RNA sequence: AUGGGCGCAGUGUCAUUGACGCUGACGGUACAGGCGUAU
């Protein structure tokens, strides 16, 4: 965990530094998995690990935009693949991202009933791992954006 | 000694002719006497690997001088089919050429030569040169006057045959 | 900074179009100078304006609701 | 204090719509003409609302044309 | 020269697509052979031939902004660097990048004036090529300038 | 918003260094501006 928190600190200066740099780096990446280049499980779990580490980093409207331009590819990648183990995989790295990302949600009352209505979907599935994320990113998304719940 | 029988394959003295004597005494002949049947001409080269000897049968591109024709052809150990890039004729005659050079060596490697890419006025684009890619020939654009690409074709020859791919000519 | 300052900068850096030359030639001049005044009319209208001008609800008009309703239509169908 | 000058830029950015690419390619250049009239009315105002109070970090971007000039001299080659 | 006008094109129309990412990746491989992750004559010319292939290909303000900044970094590239030779290869491309890119020199007197100069300076020099470049570049800039010599 | 025929800059087609345009980071840094006109 230390670890990781450095690493997130460093790439959140950077990002601070040259923050276009990082989001294309994001992008040709995720492009990388999109078009099967570059495609594992480590690698995009990796990948959305570090899309959600430097939250707060960008401006309201470049995270939003970073953030739609990546569901959007993310969502593709989705209905791409086949497979019920990778598109689990897709799954829980998109609600782990949107997660970290609680801002957008907050500014964005529909997509934010649409994710709780998918995640309580999602909650019924057997497979493994789905509904302990599911429940993780419901607890996250709660403590992150209770006055949108209430209000 | 290792030596190995190249068979040249194009109009008679189009180039066929001039390019052997260009490697042989250095000279760019200028007229034009067609080639008759076939010379039989050895021509050495001096690699980073030690000498190597073509037996270059620069044969006559003319049948009514054809002569023996594709007897020629037998036990041929490379190809170099010729081309001039500013007549078009010549170029379409090339299928035919390989087509008699495939019959007789099944299994040769064969060097498409475009010659005389020096004289300015060019008629086969290098757009259009593809017959070597369906038959997997390895394509130059030479011209045995300026001598663009002098060595490439019997470097490539030379490298294909001894096997070694990163094999050099040394000037002595 | 100040709406002025801006107005008599934009109209400074247009030069009017040329009085010598042809009735025809400075007639067409006159015309591409005053479309191209309409244009920095509207543009200066504009800053006039405010200094934001738009909201950005127009991108979930584009973009967010064309994602959002299509996730809700994901579906698993196996696999 | 500085966040709405950066969405200023980025809407007169985007209240630029640049312009519809239709036609003959001299009517196609003549509207490549004007979107660039618009791209150089755009840039000059970004750089005019960089001098107001901004100009004071951004101002050498159209003097870098001398100072690329004395790197481009002094290629000295005193040595090996 | 069938194969550069093929690869050219191809690139223009890519430029066309998007221009931004073409530009950064210049910048990125420039950067690469200046911090000295892929220095060698060969990688520096092709990129060199590279950014001359798109000449024009760009918008004027853009294409002076990058030129301005490859410029300025081949210029660091050359300070950093000592012995003959590599001065010489990154000089020769340089000048060569320069001669492919008329519509900024005549957008800059001064900039011709220097370079022509800096071309002066070259042609007494006696290492192995820098006249033939020159010579070669300085035809360029004439045959796409002249108009801005005699006026 | 419109693009005329040539200032030639890359060239696609054939009889291919000749002809029609497109197209050229072109001869062009040119030229054309309804049929008074306040659209």
Same mark, same amino acid.
């Given at each position: 965990?230390?670890?990781?928190?450095?690493?997130?600190?460093?790439?959140?200066?950077?990002?601070?530094?040259?923050?276009?740099?990082?989001?294309?780096?994001?992008?040709?990446?995720?492009?990388?998995?999109?078009?099967?280049?570059?495609?594992?499980?480590?690698?995009?779990?990796?990948?959305?690990? *570090? &899309?959600?580490?430097?939250?707060?980093?960008?401006?309201?409207?470049?995270?939003? !935009? +970073? $953030?739609?331009?990546?569901? %959007?590819?993310?969502?593709?990648?989705?209905?791409?693949?086949?497979?019920?183990?990778?598109? *689990? &995989?897709?799954?829980?790295?998109?609600?782990?991202?949107?997660?970290?990302?609680? !801002? +957008? $949600?907050?500014?964005?009352? %529909?997509?934010?009933?649409?994710?709780?209505?998918?995640?309580?979907?999602?909650?019924?599935?057997?497979?493994?791992?789905?509904?302990?994320?599911?429940?993780?990113?419901?607890?996250?998304?709660?403590?992150?954006?209770?006055?949108?719940?209430?209000? | 000694?290792?030596?190995?029988?190249?068979?040249?394959?194009?109009?008679?003295?189009?180039?066929?002719?001039?390019?052997?004597?260009?490697?042989?005494?250095?000279?760019?002949?200028?007229?034009?006497?067609?080639?008759?049947?076939?010379?039989?001409?050895?021509?050495?080269?001096?690699?980073?690997?030690?000498?190597?000897?073509?037996?270059?049968?620069?044969?006559?591109?003319?049948?009514?001088?054809?002569?023996?024709?594709?007897?020629?052809?037998?036990?041929?150990?490379?190809?170099?089919?010729?081309?001039?890039?500013?007549?078009?004729?010549?170029?379409?005659?090339?299928?035919?050429?390989?087509?008699?050079?495939?019959?007789?060596?099944?299994?040769?490697?064969?060097?498409?030569?475009?010659?005389?890419?020096?004289?300015?006025?060019?008629?086969?684009?290098?757009?259009?040169?593809?017959?070597?890619?369906?038959?997997?020939?390895?394509?130059?654009?030479?011209?045995?006057?300026?001598?663009?690409?002098?060595?490439?074709?019997?470097?490539?020859?030379?490298?294909?045959?001894?096997?070694?791919?990163?094999?050099?000519?040394?000037?002595? | 900074?100040?709406?002025?300052?801006?107005?008599?900068?934009?109209?400074?850096?247009?030069?009017?179009?040329?009085?010598?030359?042809?009735?025809?030639?400075?007639?067409?001049?006159?015309?591409?100078?005053?479309?191209?005044?309409?244009?920095?009319?509207?543009?200066?209208?504009?800053?006039?304006?405010?200094?934001?001008?738009?909201?950005?609800?127009?991108?979930?008009?584009?973009?967010?609701?064309?994602?959002?309703?299509?996730?809700?239509?994901?579906?698993?169908?196996?696999?």
């Amino acid at each position: 965990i230390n670890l990781y928190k450095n690493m997130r600190e460093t790439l959140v200066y950077l990002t601070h530094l040259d923050y276009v740099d990082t989001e294309r780096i994001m992008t040709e990446k995720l492009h990388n998995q999109v078009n099967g280049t570059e495609w594992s499980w480590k690698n995009l779990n990796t990948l959305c690990w *570090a &899309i959600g580490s430097i939250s707060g980093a960008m401006h309201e409207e470049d995270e939003k !935009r +970073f $953030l739609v331009t990546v569901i %959007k590819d993310l969502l593709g990648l989705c209905e791409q693949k086949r497979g019920k183990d990778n598109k *689990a &995989i897709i799954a829980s790295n998109i609600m782990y991202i949107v997660g970290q990302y609680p !801002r +957008f $949600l907050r500014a964005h009352w %529909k997509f934010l009933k649409t994710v709780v209505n998918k995640l309580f979907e999602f909650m019924h599935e057997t497979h493994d791992g789905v509904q302990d994320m599911a429940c993780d990113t419901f607890i996250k998304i709660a403590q992150k954006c209770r006055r949108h719940f209430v209000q | 000694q290792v030596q190995f029988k190249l068979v040249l394959v194009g109009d008679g003295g189009t180039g066929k002719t001039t390019f052997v004597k260009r490697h042989l005494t250095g000279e760019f002949e200028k007229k034009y006497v067609a080639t008759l049947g076939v010379e039989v001409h050895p021509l050495v080269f001096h690699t980073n690997r030690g000498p190597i000897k073509f037996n270059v049968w620069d044969t006559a591109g003319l049948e009514k001088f054809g002569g023996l024709r594709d007897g020629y052809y037998i036990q041929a150990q490379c190809a170099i089919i010729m081309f001039d890039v500013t007549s078009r004729v010549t170029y379409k005659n090339v299928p035919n050429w390989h087509r008699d050079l495939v019959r007789v060596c099944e299994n040769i490697p064969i060097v498409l030569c475009g010659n005389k890419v020096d004289i300015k006025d060019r008629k086969v684009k290098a757009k259009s040169i593809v017959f070597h890619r369906k038959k997997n020939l390895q394509y130059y654009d030479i011209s045995a006057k300026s001598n663009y690409n002098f060595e490439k074709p019997f470097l490539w020859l030379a490298r294909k045959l001894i096997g070694d791919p990163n094999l050099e000519f040394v000037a002595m | 900074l100040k709406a002025v300052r801006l107005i008599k900068f934009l109209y400074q850096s247009n030069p009017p179009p040329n009085p010598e030359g042809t009735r025809q030639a400075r007639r067409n001049r006159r015309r591409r100078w005053r479309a191209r005044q309409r244009q920095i009319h509207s543009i200066s209208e504009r800053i006039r304006s405010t200094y934001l001008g738009r909201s950005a609800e127009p991108v979930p008009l584009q973009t967010v609701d064309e994602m959002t309703k299509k996730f809700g239509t994901l579906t698993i169908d196996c696999n």
